[model samples]
Target: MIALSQFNSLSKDEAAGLLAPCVALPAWGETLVSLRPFASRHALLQTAREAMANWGEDELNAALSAHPRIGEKPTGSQAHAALSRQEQSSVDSENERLAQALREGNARYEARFGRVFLIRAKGRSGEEILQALTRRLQHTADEEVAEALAQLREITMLRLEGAIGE
Candidate 1:
């Protein structure tokens, strides 16, 4: 991983390229790039969190579009697919039953929430993910939206930690 100073010195385009996988929202990447030369990784992550907090509904939707439903294999951008695989390593083909449940849960979640279910799967298992899906389904519309964004924040920080050395 690159040091924070190295990340801080990247050109705007280069910074955005690296940040794309962390937060798929193009505008978010541009905003972070514009605020470069962060004193530390903590500062960068704080700014990233704040930026995400200010995302409009459309921007949030755009970010969510890049995330795959829990248990589903991520497709599209190589960075995103690779990250998803690594993050969701706990969920594997060995658990066909749990995988099927996750698929059904994802459908139900979308039917209710009208978007992909986003969770920080880094240290979670298929069973735990399913439990979260079931629990989140009970959330009110507003609550679910808030929870999804919170998960996005956690994922963004996790990815940032991987992208730049602390």
Candidate 2:
């Protein structure tokens, strides 16, 4: 983990580079970088959390747009791709039922939302993830977009905490 002090010392561009993978939106990264030199970890997270608030379809799409489809491994070794791979790597092993289920489930979500299912796959069992995905399929377009954005915020917070140590 990068120490908080070290993170504060990074150039704006460099800090954004590190923060990029945590959330796909450049504006979110810019907010954190622009407000660097946080006094404590809480301060950084407070800023991060605040920045993610009020995102609508346009903002949510900015993240979901480039993200890999659920149950599919991201191809590149870059920070964003690697982070995604790590996030969902064990769903099938956690519960083999999801191996095909989640893949096909993603197709269903995409067909419904015209976007991939943007859920946080970390820290949950396969069954839990699949169940959430299944339940979400019933959500209306507006409700689903809000759900995805909320999940994206949770994911960004987790990744940010990992990226910079308190």
Candidate 3:
């Protein structure tokens, strides 16, 4: 495999080879083409931003499958682990109330949305994730799916940054 900075500079197929493991392949394919030779890290992330800008309901649901419930040790493969470690480090501090809330919110969000409440909780506490979930649950499906996709983009950007070393 090429060094991440070099990989990051590649055209779609080369970048996709690295990014597809972090994002859904189709999403990676689309986003890799969209990102181009990023001028800065933020530019790379904005490609993710654009991808999720108006993600349809089906896309949001698909993104939900890419993540694990907050606070749970993710069961992702090596590539998945490589992607998820960014989110796991934050809520690993053993807070029972937060853990309980995560469990409840995870269940509730899944119940309401029929999928896990996915967020880039890497630097966010379980409480933060819970609060976000609580706040977001009030939105209509149309609104919430957009929020979900934005959150998914944040999570994947976190993954991409962590995995790619840039």
Candidate 4:
């Protein structure tokens, strides 16, 4: 992990590079870098959350396009892939039943809401994640979109905290 001071002092390109693994969206990284010299880590996070909140439907879809499906491993050797692997370490993908359930759930979720099933999987057990998915399957399209966006924000914040562990 790096210090927030180091993050703050970085050039815009450097800062955006540092932030890209935290949030997959290049636009988000650029926005955070542009709004630099934050008062505190809390402020930085708040600003990131606010920026996330203002994402238009197209932007949101663009961001979502990069996210891996729940219970699926991220492909490729990249910072984002490594971070996703670490974040999802708690999930026992070797468990066939659970893995199959999550696969089905992801399909169901996408069929219902037209998007990936997103949840903050860090620190949560695979079973817990499955339960959340099951529960969320009942939500209306609007409600699920709201929930997905909120989950994305939570994941982004967690990744930010991990990135600059101060």
Q: Judged by TM-score, which candidate is best? A: 1
Quantify all predictions' global Cα lDDT against the true fold.
0.84, 0.85, 0.68, 0.82
What's model 2's overall lDDT? Answer: 0.85
In model 4, where do residues sit more than 4 Å from their true spots?
A: none
- The clash count of every prediction, one per candidate, is 0, 0, 1, 0
Q: Any runs in candidate 1 off by more than 4 Å, and if so which? A: 75-77
Off by over 4 Å in 2: 93-97
Query: lDDT tens digits, residues 47-163, model 1?
Result: 888888875556657888778777777655578898988888888757888888988999999899898888999989898888999999999998888888888888988887798
lDDT score of residue 10 within candidate 3: 74
Whichever of 1 and 3 has more lDDT, that candidate is 1
Local accuracy of candidate 3 as per-residue lDDT tens digits, 19-68: 76555637655665565666666666667566656557777666556666
Minimal lDDT window, size 10, model 4: 54-63
lDDT score of residue 141 within candidate 2: 93
* Residue-by-residue lDDT tens digits, candidate 2, 1-166: 7999999999888899999878778988898899989999999999899998978889887887667776777878888888888888756655556678988888898899898788888867667888999999999998998888889889889889889997
Error of 1 at 56 (Å): 4.5
Clashing pairs in 4: none
What global local distance difference test value does model 1 have? 0.84
* Candidate 1 lDDT score at position 80: 84
Name the regions of candidate 3 deviating beyond 4 angstroms.
Answer: 1-5, 8-14, 30-48, 75-77, 163-166
